[PDB]
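Duplicate of #3305? Posting structure anyway:
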């Protein structure tokens, strides 16, 4: 390709990339042991098979939730903050933020590990929602996710202190609109001077096609097992793919940036 991984690192070292936009998916959190509720032979999957569900995805369907919210709250309990820990990929993104280079981080994940790694909410677009906040299904009052933590950990369906309605985490269910902050793409993508794509199969719209929203003068760096989605289908001259294990790819980039010590120190502070 006209650009290498090292070329991208050198742009960053020269401070030519002050406004990095990042897109991440499930691939970045596999190293943290996040279980896939859809995958046969996880504890979460087997746990979900005691409920009268037609398929595991029904836990993200509203008509099922209002019939019985307990299956969804089983997933909430497993993925609620505290259970899992960020990995090097998350800390790399935290370093980008610390260095003042992160414009915005778009995530498909609901594991909340970006927040745990210390990336401020204002830098995040959690495209599938989050457990950091919740909303009463009846009166629409917002609450911090901490307010329902105890109920969640005790297998009690959390209820609103005003109207007693079920309080549901701000996780996006099928048919629901994307979160309001998704429309930050309108300003972020035209402004980006680098796009980083990590650990996503780019199979789902409209998240996938955000890759096309950056300018053609702007490099798109993919760190992923494979070349996927619009990057595969509509490649551009300044695209760079570092294909293989995501953690190995990130560590390669860290080396080319010359950020080995800072990563070491960050990780040690956080762990
Ligand atoms: Mg209460
Ligand atoms: Zn209420």
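Output from current build:
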């Amino acid at each position: 390709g006209k650009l290498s991984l090292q070329d991208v690192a050198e742009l960053i070292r020269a401070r030519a990339c002050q406004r990095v936009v990042v897109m991440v998916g499930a691939g970045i959190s596999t190293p943290s042991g996040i279980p896939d509720f859809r995958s046969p032979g996880s504890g979460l999957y087997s746990n979900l098979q005691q409920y009268d569900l037609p398929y595991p995805e029904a836990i993200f369907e509203l008509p099922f939730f209002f019939h019985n919210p307990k299956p969804f709250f089983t997933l909430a309990k497993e993925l609620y903050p505290g259970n899992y820990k960020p990995n090097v990929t998350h800390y790399f993104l935290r370093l980008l933020h610390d260095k003042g280079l992160l414009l915005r981080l778009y995530t498909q994940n609901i594991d909340g590990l970006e927040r745990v790694s210390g990336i401020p909410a204002s830098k995040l677009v959690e495209a599938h929602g989050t457990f950091a906040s919740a909303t009463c299904t009846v009166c629409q009052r917002p609450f911090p996710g901490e307010d329902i933590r105890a109920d969640v950990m005790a297998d009690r369906v959390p209820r609103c202190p005003v109207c007693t309605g079920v309080v549901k985490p701000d996780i996006v269910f099928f048919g629901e609109p994307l979160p309001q902050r998704f429309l930050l793409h309108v300003v972020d993508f035209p402004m980006a001077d680098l796009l980083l794509i990590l650990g996503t199969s780019l199979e789902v719209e409209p998240f996938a096609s955000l890759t096309e929203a950056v300018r053609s003068s702007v490099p798109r760096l993919l760190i992923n097992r494979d070349l996927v989605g619009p990057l595969a289908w509509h490649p551009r001259s300044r695209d760079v793919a570092q294909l293989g294990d995501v953690v190995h790819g990130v560590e390669s980039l860290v080396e080319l940036l010359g950020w080995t010590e800072e990563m070491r120190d960050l990780v040690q502070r956080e762990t």
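Confirmed duplicate; merging threads. Residues 69 and 157 are 7 Å apart (CA to CA). Residues 136, 138-139, 141, 160, 162-163, 165 surround zinc ion (ligand 2) (CB under 6 Å).
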